[PDB]
Design a protein around this ligand. Structure first.
Ligand code: ZN
Lengths: 263, 341, 235, 150, 91
DNA sequence: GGAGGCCAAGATCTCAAT
């Protein structure tokens, strides 16, 4: 119910509800999401993965493992009858508007080509590679709260446990197939508001000065130049006002720079 | 129930090296560093922990022995539980997250899992890094250069027949031609790279596109080669390592060590001494070390260390000093309740 | 319960530090050190002893022990590194001398290493590399010196297994003002939200061990804070 | 199945020199150093390993036999595999990771490739560097000058 | 220092035969035009059974310009095991 | 005849360098 996967299901992956089949009464947790059975109403899907494991899935988690070739195309011609799955879509992202219950797929050109005509009536698809996600997030007037899936990936279980709802532009949680522990949550948070502020204030400086700033912050973040040398460079090119906008965290600095260089 | 702190040194009889993904750049191979290229390196405690966990696993395998048919009594699931700590079939006990002192029965029956934990059970053995003492105790060892065995020793040509000599000549010619062609492609790629920074934002894409296409042209050129896909003559890249005779400070601990778990750890260190090497590049006999640890504990009721003994590992043997350590080893050897399955 | 004076502890960082969302606090390190010294894991006993060496603030329910603050020199500043942990399945591990594999046609079924339950786990975490690590506290300098020098504690996450946050050359120098909980109205450690202190909001326990207990709404400083080592030594 | 450790010394009858690509500079020819520019030199374990590997290869070549023409049964590929440890035809029995007892049969049948190994097969032999016992046991030799003989 | 990890009798015998053949031309390195590289070496062979506290010396290999000296019955046993095993396929 | 096991296939691309 009140789980991030339900929001993804309703907004995006309820399209293949007709092909799911009927559930079975189950007595164990959903290994995919781990939530208690009390939010399943006792029904779930029994599945065997290629590793020969008996995993129980709720309805929202099952949509990542459902093959509907007539709806989602086919990903590998060697296996004609197995369609593209949300649980196997490497390189495909999605921005999900929870309140409006609408979703926006960010698929690359190859995946878009593989998609049949019937797909586009149900899901709005944007042609954008993995590197072009940042452009879409930057330019689009985002509606919050939203779930932004950066990469559906192949490791569904870790994607499902890592789904988080972004309440504001301060903290957009980029969700991928990598497990979101508290030790690596700095890599999967994007300070869009501060990046946009820095981009707005980066326009006052020259292109050469901007490149110097980006290279100096990147080298300093990787312990490649001494702080004294970086400070001398910043003073020389008058980049001190820019430096005060960056977070002290080097990983946040690198995320913000990666966003600036893409937009 | 006491904490056993192992403080000591590790002296490298041979260069000591380790390959870590984030420390090995494309510019060269480097040891792990806590900072830039001017920082002093260290030998990861993860590598030492893995080596000692394998030694403890070998101790357990030797102790348990082999079945009547001669096959090891551990299946794949138990093997990965003892070795990597993962449970592959989902049959492991899942303790409640609230408590800390969990798995008391499992810790009592399986000393290896108690020392080195599994997923869901914290391990009592902490193994720290090997921090160097000096300031110039690392250097770029290895290196060398692969040669052609027939261009170096002419007596080897007498063994080859005429067809094989012709094949060798074709191989050398192909190697030279491919070297020249690939050098030209790399030159063009580098020319693209130099103007890449000066390139405009729109041009940032297709320059990378041509670099990519140049890369697969190199791959296709090497695929066109028939006698050999790889040039036999090539410079070998050196690896960074700690020099011979480097002194590295090492700290190890066992938290709440029973006599049996500490005995298993001492036995692992004893068995580790038969082949006492960390790290890789064993082809150059790298990694061989000698270490001496001062086993100490905490005085009950106050913050005062108490020395229990000392473990010295040398090429000439293992010296265990201290009656307490022998008591731990004997307690491990005499226990008849352990079940590692 | 003793004559507790405010001290600042500065240690040299030898290994990159992995921060579990909330910056490590010195009372956590001292709790681990005492859990090793006292051969007991009971939180009640360790906390009862920890209060003999760290001042405990009853009003807020937190120890006078600041969180981590990286000390940067002009030679080296706060850097970005990854903590790499991998499964090394050597030929010894994949051998019949250790386990009996399942056999088909006499051949041994190979371990599926690219994925599954038996995959090489390439677990990587963000880490921070700075020349110095600095904590502020009010307590017995002798006991904290002994615990930091002799116990098996690091600064950060999972020092026991990965040896992240290894440190040495623990230097303790007395302070003039207690800067362990508050400084100019900004919280320097996880404090209750009702304390009136400013900082990043979050959910965490107030006393160690921070992975055990009900998680209240707290206010904590930024996980990665840096201060110049010259300004730290000023005292 | 035992571990044998060869601990000993190498005594020098004639000057011992080696040209390592990363050790020599434009300034001049230098021996590889035991870490740093001012440290004691050493003789690389790579050179000793290569010399002993080729010696073992010739042992194998002599043991297998030479025909009346003095030719060995091994083609070019076998010679390269046994001495250089490199395969040219691409027929080397690549062991996918996860194979149980990967080199068992190859090691049992080919003691040379078991001792010294190849890519994908760890060699059992590790030959370390040679470290001098004292100081100033190295110096600049060679020298001289070519001259018009007339 | 040289070592063979988990050496059977046959592989150790091959290594010892390599050392014996190396003694005929005990040359390391280059600049052989000045006869650089001649060496004489002696190695003490020891084995260490895991689980025990001390190693045991098997013998000694001495390479001198006057000959090759191999001591200890174990090294001779290794050489004989290599020279008398006819199940080796090097192709 | 599942049932074990292998092997090939699936999007596009990652700048830090004494
Ligand atoms: Zn679920």
């Amino acid at each position: 119910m009140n789980h991030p996967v339900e929001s993804v299901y309703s907004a995006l992956t309820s399209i293949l509800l007709p092909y799911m089949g009927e559930p079975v009464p189950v007595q164990r947790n959903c290994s995919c999401c781990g939530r208690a059975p009390s939010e399943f109403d006792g029904v779930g899907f029994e599945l065997v993965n290629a590793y020969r494991e008996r995993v129980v899935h709720c309805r929202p988690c099952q949509t990542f493992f459902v093959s509907a070739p007539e709806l989602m195309g086919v990903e590998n011609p060697k296996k004609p009858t197995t369609g593209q799955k949300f649980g196997m879509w490497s390189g495909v992202g999605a921005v999900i508007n929870v309140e409006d219950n609408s979703s926006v797929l960010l698929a690359p050109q190859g995946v878009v080509n593989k998609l049949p005509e019937h797909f586009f009536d149900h899901v709005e698809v944007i042609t954008a590679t993995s590197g072009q996600h940042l452009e879409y997030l930057f330019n689009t007037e985002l509606k919050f709260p939203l779930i932004y899936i950066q990469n559906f990936g192949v490791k569904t279980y870790e994607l499902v446990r890592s789904l988080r709802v972004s309440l504001s532009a301060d903290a957009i949680y980029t969700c991928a197939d990598q497990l979101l522990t508290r030790q690596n949550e700095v890599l999967y948070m994007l300070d869009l508001k501060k990046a946009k502020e820095l981009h707005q204030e980066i326009k006052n400086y020259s292109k050469k000065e901007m490149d110097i700033f980006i290279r100096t912050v990147t080298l300093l973040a990787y312990s490649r130049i001494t702080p004294e040398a970086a400070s001398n460079e910043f003073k020389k090119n008058n980049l001190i006002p820019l430096l005060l906008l960056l977070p002290t965290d080097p990983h946040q600095r690198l995320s913000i720079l990666h966003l600036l260089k893409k937009v | 129930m006491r904490t056993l702190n192992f403080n000591g040194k590790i002296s490298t009889l041979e260069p000591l090296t380790v390959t870590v993904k984030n420390a090995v750049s494309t510019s060269g191979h480097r040891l792990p560093r806590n900072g830039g290229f001017n920082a002093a390196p260290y030998f990861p405690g993860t590598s030492i922990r893995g080596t000692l966990r394998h030694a403890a696993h070998k101790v357990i395998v030797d102790r348990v022995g082999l079945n009547a048919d001669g096959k090891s009594p551990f299946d794949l699931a138990e093997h990965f539980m003892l070795a990597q700590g993962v449970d592959i079939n989902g049959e492991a006990e899942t303790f409640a997250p609230g408590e800390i002192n969990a798995g008391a029965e499992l810790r009592s029956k399986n000393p290896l899992i108690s020392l080195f934990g599994r997923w869901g059970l914290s391990g009592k053995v902490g193994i720290g890094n090997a921090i160097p003492d000096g300031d110039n105790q690392w250097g770029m060892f290895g290196g060398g250069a692969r040669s052609i065995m027939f261009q170096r020793d002419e007596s080897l040509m007498e063994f080859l027949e005429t067809d094989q000599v012709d094949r060798l000549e074709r191989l050398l010619e192909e190697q030279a031609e491919a070297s020249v062609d690939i050098s030209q492609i790399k030159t063009e790629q580098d020319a693209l790279k130099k103007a890449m920074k000066s390139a405009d934002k729109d041009t940032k894409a297709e320059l990378q596109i041509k670099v990519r296409e140049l890369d697969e042209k190199i791959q296709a050129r090497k695929d066109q080669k028939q006698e050999s896909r790889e040039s036999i003559r090539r410079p070998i890249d050196p690896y960074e390592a700690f020099i011979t005779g480097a002194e590295l400070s090492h700290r190890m601990s066992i938290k709440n060590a029973t006599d049996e778990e500490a005995g298993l750890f001492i036995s692992a260190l004893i068995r580790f001494a038969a082949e006492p090497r960390f790290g890789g590049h064993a082809n150059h006999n790298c990694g061989l070390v000698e270490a001496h640890w001062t086993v100490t504990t905490w005085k009950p009721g106050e913050l005062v260390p108490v020395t229990l003994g000392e473990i010295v590992i040398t090429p000439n043997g293992v010296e265990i000093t201290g009656d307490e350590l022998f008591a731990m080893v004997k307690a491990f050897n005499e226990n008849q309740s352990f079940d590692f399955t | 319960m003793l004559n507790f004076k405010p001290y600042r502890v500065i240690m040299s960082s030898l290994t990159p530090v992995v921060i579990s969302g909330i910056a490590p606090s010195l009372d956590g390190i001292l709790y681990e050190a005492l859990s090793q010294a006292i051969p007991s894991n009971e939180p009640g006993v360790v906390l009862a002893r920890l209060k003999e060496i760290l001042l405990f603030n009853d009003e807020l329910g937190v120890f006078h022990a600041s969180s981590l603050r990286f000390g940067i020199t002009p030679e080296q500043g706060i850097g970005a590194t990854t903590s790499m942990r991998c499964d090394y399945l050597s030929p010894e591990k994949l051998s019949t001398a250790m386990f009996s594999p399942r056999t088909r046609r006499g051949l041994f079924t190979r371990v599926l290493l690219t994925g599954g339950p038996t995959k090489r786990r390439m677990t990587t975490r963000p880490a921070y590399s700075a020349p110095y690590l600095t904590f502020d506290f009010v307590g017995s300098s002798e006991a904290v010196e002994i615990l930091l020098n002799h116990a098996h504690v690091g600064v950060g996450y999972d020092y026991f297994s990965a040896a992240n946050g290894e440190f040495n050359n623990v230097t303790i120098l007395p302070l003039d003002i207690d800067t362990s909980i508050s400084n100019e109205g900004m919280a320097l450690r996880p404090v209750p939200v009702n304390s009136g202190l400013n900082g990043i909001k979050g959910v965490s326990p107030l006393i160690p061990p921070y992975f055990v207990g009900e998680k209240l709404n707290i206010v904590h400083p930024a996980p990665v804070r840096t201060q110049l080592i010259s300004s730290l030594l000023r005292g």
